[PDB]
Amino acid sequence: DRVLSLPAVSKNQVLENVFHTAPKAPVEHLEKMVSANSKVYDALNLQSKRVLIWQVKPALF
Amino acid sequence: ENDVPAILKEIDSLVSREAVSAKEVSDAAVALTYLQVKANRRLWGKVLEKAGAAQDYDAASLTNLLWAINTGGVEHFKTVAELAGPAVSLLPSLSPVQLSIVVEALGGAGVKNYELYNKASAVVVSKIGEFKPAEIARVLYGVAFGGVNDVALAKAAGKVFASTEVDSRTAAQALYALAKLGRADKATVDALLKSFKKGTESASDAAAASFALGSLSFKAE
After folding, report:
1. Looking at the structure, do residues B163 and B173 belong to the same domain, yes or no?
2. Residue B179: Cβ-neighbour burial (10 angstroms; 0-12, 13-18, 19+)
3. Within an 8 Å CB–CB cutoff, is residue B45 touching chain A?
4. Are residues B63 and B115 in the same domain?
5. Residues from chain B contacting residue A57 (CB–CB below 8 Å)
6. How far is CA B154 from the centre of its chain?
7. One domain for residues B105 and B192
8. Do B45 and A59 touch (CB under 8 A)?
9. Could you tell me the residue range of the domain that residue B105 belongs to?
10. Residue B98 region by backbone torsions, left for phi larger than 0, else alpha for psi between -120 and 50, else beta
11. Chain B: residue nearest A60 by CA?
12. Is B46's CB within 8 Å of A60's CB?
């Protein structure tokens, strides 16, 4: 019964109770907010190719 | 030293910036009126866009803008008809001549604002001797072309036109307004036809008196 003096918590259980969640990378915030502020740039700049300012306040020719 | 498209491009860049207040709009419209810019519609459209967008308004900026809208012959009904807010909010604060230009511009475009014409008619019959008769003809033009069948202002104008000698342009405006009202009151019309004795300086005014005396079917004078 040598096995009953070893720690009963396996190395698997340590590795799954210590690294429980896959941690958030810091570049995920950058790439997500950049891919959404590209849409903020596209709609709302006055130099984008697809501005909303002519679909919203049309013109007066 | 005398480059008018240069000043047209600089006032194009005056009303193309993002925080233009009402006074720059008013002075740009007045500068476009004095420069006779009828070929370029996009610049007038930029001035009208920024005129509808601007929110703060005092008396002189609103009246210079409305005078420029008349005299330039520009029409956009949404912008001019939404300028009845600054008009009716500033109506005691407007001078007699400023109230005349405001009601003339908002009537000549066709704005259907019965609060404005009622609160203007009460001012014209409250302070009637205080007004020059050209201002009387301007408010008569406005209330006539604003869809208000105002008998009180028409009679209080006719008493003044019986009392005071008026100008030819003033008489032509009052004839046009009374013909739009469709009155044909002879005691006003023959009093207004003694003002076509100097000659008429603008044949627009002689043409308008021609049309008014034709629709009222009076005389060939």
Report:
1. yes
2. buried
3. yes
4. no
5. 49
6. 17
7. yes
8. yes
9. 83-200
10. alpha
11. B45
12. yes
